[PDB]
Structures are given as C-alpha cells and as structure tokens.
Amino acid sequence: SDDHVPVDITDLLDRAAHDAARIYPDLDVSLVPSPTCIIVGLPAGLRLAVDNAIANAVKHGGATLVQLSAVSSRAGVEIAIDDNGSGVPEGERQVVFERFSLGLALVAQQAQLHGGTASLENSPLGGARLVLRLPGP
Amino acid sequence: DDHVPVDITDLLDRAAHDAARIYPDLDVSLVPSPTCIIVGLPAGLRLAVDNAIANAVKHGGATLVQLSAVSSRAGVEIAIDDNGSGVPEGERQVVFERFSLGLALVAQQAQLHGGTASLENSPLGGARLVLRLPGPS
Amino acid sequence: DDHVPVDITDLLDRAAHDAARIYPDLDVSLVPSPTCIIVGLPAGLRLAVDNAIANAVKHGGATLVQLSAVSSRAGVEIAIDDNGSGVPEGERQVVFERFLGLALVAQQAQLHGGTASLENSPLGGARLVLRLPGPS
C-alpha cells in the first residue's frame, strides 16, 4: 500500500495493446479512445492482469480481435478487455477466476489487491468482456 | 510462493542505472524493450542481473554492457551482453557451476523460476548471458 | 541456507514507514538510494535497523531519523542518522557489546561478515553505519 504509486491506466492499456500486438501475430488489439485516468496501485500487477486477460482471450478463446477500454467515474476506473473469441459461459465464470492459466485467477488476485473486483460479462464483439473495477484514490 | 508480479523490463532499467553508478566509465543500459511482466522473486532476479554485470566488468573487463528483454507467449528471454573477454565455448558449464568468473547465482535464480541460464557469444564481442524464464499466462 | 536475497533498500523503506506509525513526533524516512540486493538474513537485518531507530528515539531523544543505503563493488553501507543527543565517544565501541544498547546490531553485522560502527551525524546525534559485503 505504501508500495502503491501513481498509475496512468490509459497509458498502461495503450502500451499493453502495443506489446500484445508484437506477441500475437493474428491479433488486432487496440485501446479504444478513453479519457486519461490516474489511479494509485501496483503497475506490474495491473499490467499483469491485462496481459493475462489478453493471453486467455487468444490462447483459450481464439480471439483475433481484442479491445481495451477505461471508463472513469467518481468511484474509480472500469477497465474492460473485450474479445471476439468463444467467450466464457455464465456457468463457468467462477472456476475461471479460481483457475490459473481458461484461467483468470491472476486478474482476480490483482483486482483484490487494489480493493476492487473482476467480473465476466458478454462482449458485443462476440466473446468475453472481462471487467476490472478499481476504486479511485 | 513468495513470488509476485515483476516488471522485468523496469528491473533491467534500474539495474543498468544503478550499475552505471557503481562502475565508473562502464557504458551500461537497457536496450529498447517491450514491457514484460512475470511472476517471480524481484530480489533474486535483480541479484542475478547484478551478478552478471559484475562478472562482465570484474572478470571480463567489459566497458560496454547492454541489458535486454524479449517477450513471447513462452515468457521472457533476458540477456546481458558485454564487450569483454567472453567465455570460451568449452568453459560455459564450469563457469555456471562456480560462485563469483562465476555465474552459479544466476543459474540458481533461473532454476527457482523454472527457467534456464546459458552463455552465448555476444554481438558486442564478449559474453551474452541469457536467462530464459516462463511467463505467467 | 538461511541467507537469501534481500532488497536492503526496500527493507529500509518498510522500516521507516512502520517506525513513522509507532513513534509519536518522529520524522523518519529513507533518503533516495539505489536498490541494493545483498544476500542475508531478512528478519535479522530488519531487527538491526529497528533497533538502531529505537535507540535513537528512546535513548537519544531523536525527532528526526534518516535511513540511507550506498552501494559500491564491495557491498552496501547502510546508515541510520539522527538528531538526538548522540553516543559519547568513549561509549561508541562498548555500546555494541550491550543490550545506549546496540548488541543486536553488531550481532547481525557479524552474521553477515560485516561491521557496525558509530560516528557523528550531520543531523546532530549519532550516525550508525552498517557495512555489509555484497554477493558478487
């Protein structure tokens, strides 16, 4: 907590999409225009969570399209990773957040370390929409 | 585990900055690299890097060192390249079996992370120590 | 082995943050310092820093303490400087033999093949220097 520093979430997502582009040659991955949101947290952990989300979308959902977004509000930030993959069935969302890599346990762990939550929804893109809701500073 | 998210790329950047202060006249830097997060032991990873720089300078007589990290689905390949004397091809194993020219600390850390440490010939002229570490996804 | 990689810098930071909570009317911080990883005993090294701070405050009446780490090829020099009343010159070796009482600090220095000594601090009180050899 004394370990938490300023984190430009939008910048983090931008760099995340860029590095993911180089790792996954199939992949159309981008940050959707978002206002600049700064929170206090653990930049490695938050980047890990995004990396891990993108990695599941591709390795396990077979996504060829991923969209990152950040929406600011008085409560904090809502980070979403949307993909056009096979998705995650409503019935399977729980094991998935308990499983380490389909396994998103790293995401739930980092969400919790930040006082926040990670949840799965369905994406307009066709696959999963993973949502990290982190309290603001 | 006591393993936590580690931004390998930032670790290298700090290592090079700190090394440049200990070793006057050493030209040491992180080469342009994507941000790579793994789960690992930041004190042990930093120490492995520190040890590799120290061996390059103290025993290889290096005046130029470049750190790098290359990311893949498999994880990360960290390299410490130097312009020193190098390690002859027939001598690499003995060097890894020795503590500090001795790189056993490096091998120990690589093994703790489920990866490998090895020596190659550097484009700079001296040794290239490569740590290959599995990713978290 | 008991001795494991220790980020000394991070250790000093945690020590300062916790001390700032424990002692009323204390300004205690880590001064900008490189990351120094040594191999050592984390519980014992933290105890040593904790003990140095406790001595400065409780016995020295310090209201300001600065922790710092300087690295070199030989290892790390950890310093705990204070604005308290200091340690009298005639006491500065013997204090490391007693449990005002710094035996815990000397014990950890020795376990690490290092040294602990006391000098005057630019802040007015004591400067406790702990020099630990590096792992390379």
CATH number at residue A129: 3.30.565.10
Q: Which two tokens stand for residue C82?
A: 């204070």
Residues B122/B128, Cβ–Cβ less than 8 Å: yes
Q: Are strands B127-134 and B75-82 parallel, antiparallel or unpaired?
A: antiparallel
CA distance linking residue A94 with residue A92, whole number of Å: 6
| Residues of chain B found within 8 Å of residue C135, distances taken between Cβ atoms | 47, 50-51, 105
| Residues of chain A found within 8 Å of residue B10, distances taken between Cβ atoms | 44
Find all residues with CB under 8 Å of B59, minimum gap 6, and list them: B84, B85, B100, B101
Find all residues with CB under 8 Å of C88, minimum gap 6, and list them: none
Does the beta-carbon distance from B73 to A55 stay under 8 Å?
Answer: yes
| Residues of chain A found within 8 Å of residue B37, distances taken between Cβ atoms | 44, 47-48, 51
CA distance linking residue C70 with residue C4, whole number of Å: 20
Q: Which domain holds residue A101?
A: 1-137
Query: Number of structural domains, chain A?
Result: 1
Counting DSSP H helices and E strands in chain A, the numbers are 4, 7
Does the beta-carbon distance from B47 to C39 stay under 8 Å?
Answer: yes
Does the beta-carbon distance from A44 to B73 stay under 8 Å?
Answer: no
Q: Is C17 on the interface with A (CB under 8 A)?
A: yes
What are residue A71's phi and psi, to 5 degrees? -125, 120
| DSSP element (H, E) containing B6 | strand B4-7
